[PDB]
Amino acid sequence: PCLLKTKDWWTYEFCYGRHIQQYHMEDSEIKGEVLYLGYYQSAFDWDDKRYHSQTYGNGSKCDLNGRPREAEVRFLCDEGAGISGDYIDRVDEPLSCSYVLTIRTPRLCP
Ligand SMILES: OC[C@H]1O[C@H](OC[C@H]2O[C@H](OC[C@H]3O[C@@H](O)[C@@H](O)[C@@H](O)[C@@H]3O)[C@@H](O)[C@@H](O)[C@@H]2O)[C@@H](O)[C@@H](O)[C@@H]1O
């Protein structure tokens, strides 16, 4: 089941191994266009300490440059040691329409 987080205008939906989505909510409905940050492309897992990365590509065309959106996902230790499972921590956008999502998860903790 997909992880969700709202930051200002955009709500972000992370569907692990499928795609990443960005869209606007009003009340509790998706008002408008749904944008794709990217579709699942690759993943690397390392274990025994721990590391996990995924990449997502060919999302919606960027109006700034006409290039598809692209995203990478970092997976880091949930340092709150919480009890609600994984969560979207940050979304960063270091180049127009290129994103780095950071997910926190108890499974990546030492
Ligand atoms: O073009 C690259 C960016 O595209 C997308 O962001 C577009 C803008 O989104 C937000 O504004 C849209 C909404 O803002 C509201 O305040 C109202 O004005 C609405 O009518 C309007 O639809 C806002 O975040 C802007 O700063 C964005 O430019 C995203 O995909 C971005 O990640 C891209 O950078």
UniProtKB/Swiss-Prot annotation:
Intramolecular disulfide bonds. Isoform 1 and isoform 2 are N-glycosylated. Ubiquitously expressed. Found as well in all tumor cell lines analyzed, amplified in sarcomas. Highly expressed in osteosarcoma SJSA-1 and rhabdomyosarcoma Rh30 cell lines. It is found in: Endoplasmic reticulum lumen. Disulfide bonds join 2-15, 62-97, 77-109. Induction: Up-regulated in response to endoplasmic reticulum stress (at protein level). Glycans are attached at residue 58. Coiled coil: none annotated. Residues 1-110 form the MRH domain. It comes from the Eukaryota. A mannooligosaccharide derivative binds at residues 9-10, 22, 63, 69, 93, 99. Lectin component of the HRD1 complex, which functions in endoplasmic reticulum (ER) quality control and ER-associated degradation (ERAD). Specifically recognizes and binds improperly folded glycoproteins as well as hyperglycosylated proteins, retain them in the ER, and transfers them to the ubiquitination machinery and promote their degradation. Possible targets include TRPV4 as well as hyperglycosylated HSP90B1. Component of the HRD1 complex, which comprises at least SYNV1/HRD1, DERL1/2, FAM8A1, HERPUD1/HERP, OS9, SEL1L and UBE2J1. FAM8A1 is stabilized by interaction with SYNV1, which prevents its proteasomal degradation. OS9 and UBE2J1 recruitment to the complex may be mediated by SEL1L. Through this complex, may interact with ERLEC1 and HSPA5. Interacts (via C-terminus) with CPNE6 (via second C2 domain); this interaction occurs in a calcium-dependent manner in vitro. Interacts with CREB3. Belongs to the OS-9 family. This is Protein OS-9. It comes from Homo sapiens (Human). The lineage of its organism: Eukaryota, Metazoa, Chordata, Craniata, Vertebrata.
